[PDB]
Amino acid sequence: KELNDLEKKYNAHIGVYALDTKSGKEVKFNSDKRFAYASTSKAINSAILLEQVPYNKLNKKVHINKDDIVAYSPILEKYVGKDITLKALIEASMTYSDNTANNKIIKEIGGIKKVKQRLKELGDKVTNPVRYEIELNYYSPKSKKDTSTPAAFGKTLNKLIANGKLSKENKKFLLDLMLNNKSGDTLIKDGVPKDYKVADKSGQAITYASRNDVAFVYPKGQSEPIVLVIFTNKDNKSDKPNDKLISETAKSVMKEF
Ligand SMILES: *P(=O)(O)CNC(=O)OCc1ccccc1
């Protein structure tokens, strides 16, 4: 189905960027529009830490205190005044979408400053990390704070994971979390054919029914993933997202590959 027609049908704005890393073939829809990325950056944050810490060192520990906790920290909440390994941080962040794990991660990398630095080095001058969790979820169509374009975000994932500097194991560790993650089930995982493997990281901003899904999609018989970035929003601040919109956009995009 047409992407515009999906916009119409679901009464929403869609931004799509798809790269078959095999062919170099891109699918684009509103790919230069800014959208709040939300928890989808947990993926980006996670990869960056992993370029600086070999798999064998994930056993390293970080001390968590009451000052570390932010809302929606289903895992980290139990670690107050405790230590956690880098490995468990990442798993908390990617699997349960733990906000505190994401924040400690950004810290480990060295701050937003360092994330931002790293992005420019990948040639990403678009992705705009400004706040920590959970504030970064406070989206305004009038602020560029914590937003990116489907195209810049999509090129970043590609340079970071798909064709990056990650070790084999790290790469696999991250990707295994994206595959197993059960939170993205209604998203991209629900729109592609039965055959494909879907490594996703979903997101949801607080405002304007900001519902996202990024993935490394593996068509049966293909070992190279299609990078798929789906950013969505609505016109009203208080609008509720419909997951079906993404499943359906995913399905439409799959057709081109
Ligand atoms: P990620 O899952 O996208 C981080 N988002 C988050 O922690 O909260 C956003 C939120 C809170 C309440 C309702 C809708 C979205």
Ligand 1 atom at shortest distance from the alpha carbon of 204: 3
Compute the distance between CA of residue 6 and CA of residue 252 in angstroms, rounded to an integer: 9
Q: Determination method here?
A: X-ray
The rounded radius of gyration (Å) of the Cα atoms in the chain is 17
**Closest to 229 measured CA to CA, from 16, 42, 68:** 16
Q: Which pairs with CB-CB distance under 8 Å and at least 24 residues apart come from 23-28?
A: 25/256, 25/257, 27/253, 27/256, 27/257, 28/150, 28/151
CB 233 within 8 A of CB 210: yes
Say yes or no: CB of residue 70 within 6 Å of ligand 1.
no
Whether residue 39 lies in the annotated active site: yes
Q: Three-state SS across 123-143?
A: CCCCCCCCCCCCHHHCCCCCC
Write b or e for each residue in 125-156: b if 16 or more Cβ atoms lie within 10 A of its Cβ, otherwise e: ebbbbeebbbebbebeeeeebbbbbbbbbbbb
Say yes or no: CB of residue 127 within 6 Å of ligand 1.
no
Residue 201 marked in a binding site: yes
Residue 31 marked in a binding site: no
- Positive or negative CA dihedral for 167, 170, 174, 176? positive
Neighbour tally for 50: CB within 10 Å: 26
Say yes or no: CB of residue 137 within 6 Å of ligand 1.
yes
Structure token digits, residue 194 = 């039965």
Q: Where are the domains of the chain?
A: 1-257
CATH topology of domain 1-257: Beta-lactamase (3.40.710)
- Report the interhelical angle of 168-180 vs 41-49 (nearest 10°): 160
CB 102 within 8 A of CB 72: no
